[PDB]
Design a protein around this ligand. Structure first.
Ligand SMILES: *Cc1c(COP(=O)(O)O)cnc(C)c1O
Ligand SMILES: *Cc1c(COP(=O)(O)O)cnc(C)c1O
Ligand SMILES: NCCCNCCCN
Lengths: 367, 371
């Protein structure tokens, strides 16, 4: 590994997609990759051996689905524009509108697509712009709408989906039986250890039998969950009261959700002792060595955390940030002109494959 | 002016940029300090030649910024990194006039590959910070052979005043004083909000001039934000307007992808002809007046939290109206994203003749070739 690099493990992605395929086969639901979280171009054909297509937020994702996967394309945007709707309609099997005005504006340009409406389920979200509330369905012509859609969950359980479906059916139930399909969105933490997979299958099966509809699920995170790591090197080690490792990667540019959320990444063969925000998480044990892990941007707060290792770090050691393929790459930056981590794939034969190697132009042509 | 443009777009105004640069050139003129653009915050490719009319060069964090400085400006190049790497030091050395190291180890490791460059060390001034990895603390200078070192560097400020640089200089001279006289230059870093209304320019000039004279050193300043301050806006359109208790305008831009610092810091952008009533985080800022209309302005990503804030306007918004987010050229473009495949704002220049030029028009490949 020339560093930094995001490295997706084929074997792990395959195990995730096997489980998701199993959910679809046992429940009758169709499972789609939500590209927002996980769009790893080197793995799109692999994902497509298992899943039915992509869910896409607009033109660029729809184009990406077409090019990389070429399976079903489902497109939802809070904001379709006039200049893009034609190409989106040419590519998309399903198009979900966020408002009735959007539906009405674009219905005549989407006559070959199966149309849906996003439903605001209003379930603990106040003042959300996403979806249509139930009261606004009264009096509206739904003859041209074949699907209802919701997305209401983030890193959640089968029990949470049950709770959402209960409210979805109480508020929207009069309009469900007349649809061909319903899309339960994403946020289902299906490949996480301990998730109640049998419950999800039963919920999807039971709903489909109850209303005679095709169920769709559109996980993003669950596809990329624990499928790979960001690998960095120790470039320098300095002392300022604590021992501090400066790495060739950056929180802010390469793991931006660690700063936004905020959260602290786990590190292979290490334990988190304290967060960058100085929250104490654990105490150092015997025969452990504490380091601040820090990044290569010029920012004062480019700090991953304080971590306990069981050996001393040396310049040139590799640090492995765990579970860094979803909601990372898709949102990363070239801030401060920091060299981007290459995208790599560890294939089923344990051979490392370069998928994208970035260069100066990735930075210069974006400024 | 804005009506025929594809939105969204960041629009830099030449006249405003030139006013800032005139002022920074005035500081250099009067103090003898040499002023550099810190590319971290402002790297607008279409403006680099304009900035070079006024400033002496660029401060760069590494290889990619040094190459950009070389290509776009072709003036002095000053490189500092907390973490130089072996695979890049060669090319950084061929491009840079000054190289500033973050630690003695990094200096000792790369001294022999940097013989044609002027070498500096970054000083941790330790002032109001704890556990900072940036710079060397004064105690670690003691009894170190500094023969090969021609400059000292600090960067200790953010959006600050001439009085705050005065307080930092006092601490810097107190702690590192005994080694300043032997240097050829000192670099006072960035964070000087020189072009903000009210800044005490006169005092900055005196501080720089006195310091220069006292120690017999060439002083360097390396503002980023100051160069870009109030030079331009991000222009978006209202794509849809919906209601959920409040009126909500959904725009073709995203706080998360296009104004990331609004989410990270967090802070709320001002909007042309509007007043902030409340932040995305529900902080009350002001009350609606009698003849105004309140709207939540929100983005086009699929995230629930892609909300800019609640703002008061003098008239109702309509689909197709342009929303102008004020002061969006610095610490924006340089750190924006194609998250959710959102179409990037184009980069445009409103030039000195009031003509709008396209600098960069983005496309699908800017997204697909990054995933
Ligand atoms: C984000 C999103 C998804 C995927 O959510 P995950 O948490 O990654 O599973 C699915 N559908 C829509 C409409 C989304 O906005
Ligand atoms: C960020 C930075 C600057 C510029 O800072 P501004 O606040 O944009 O003026 C200059 N030098 C160094 C070393 C920096 O990290
Ligand atoms: N005035 C700039 C402060 C330094 N860094 C800011 C980085 C956040 N965009």
């Amino acid at each position: 590994i020339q560093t930094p690099a995001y490295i997706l493990e084929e074997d792990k992605l395959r195990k995730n997609c096997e489980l998701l395929a199993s959910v679809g086969e046992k429940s009758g639901a169709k499972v789609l990759l939500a590209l927002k979280g996980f769009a790893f171009s080197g793995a799109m054909k692999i994902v497509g051996e298992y899943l039915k297509g992509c869910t896409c937020s607009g033109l660029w994702e729809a184009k990406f689905a077409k090019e990389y996967m070429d399976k079903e394309i489902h497109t939802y945007s809070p904001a379709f524009k006039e200049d893009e709707i034609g190409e989106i309609a040419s590519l998309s099997h399903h198009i979900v509108f966020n408002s009735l005005a959007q539906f009405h504006k674009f219905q005549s340009k989407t006559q070959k697509n199966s149309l849906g409406l996003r439903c605001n389920v209003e379930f603990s979200g106040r003042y959300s712009r996403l979806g249509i509330r139930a009261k606004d369905f009264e009096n509206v012509d739904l003859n041209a709408i074949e699907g209802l859609h919701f997305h209401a969950l983030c890193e959640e359980s089968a029990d949470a989906l049950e709770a959402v479906l209960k409210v979805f059916e109480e508020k929207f139930g009069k309009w469900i039986g007349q649809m061909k399909w319903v899309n339960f969105g994403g946020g289902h933490h299906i490949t996480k250890k301990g998730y109640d997979v049998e419950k999800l299958i039963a919920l999807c099966k039971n709903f489909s039998d109850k209303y005679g509809v095709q169920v769709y699920l559109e996980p993003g995170e669950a596809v990329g969950w624990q499928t790979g790591n960001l690998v960095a090197s120790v470039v320098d080690i300095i002392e300022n009261e604590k021992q501090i490792a400066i790495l060739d990667t950056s929180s802010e540019a390469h793991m931006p959700d660690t700063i936004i959320m905020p959260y602290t990444s786990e590190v292979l063969n290490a334990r988190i002792l304290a967060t960058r925000e100085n929250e104490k998480i654990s105490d150092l044990k015997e025969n452990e060595f504490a380091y601040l892990l820090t990044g290569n941007t010029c920012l004062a707060g480019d700090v991953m955390g304080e971590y306990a290792f069981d050996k001393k770090l040396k310049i040139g050691d590799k640090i492995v940030f765990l579970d860094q393929i979803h909601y990372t790459i898709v949102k990363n930056t070239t801030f401060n002109g920091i060299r981007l981590p290459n995208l790599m794939l560890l294939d089923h034969k344990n051979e490392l494959q370069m998928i994208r190697e970035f260069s100066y132009k990735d930075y210069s042509l974006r400024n």
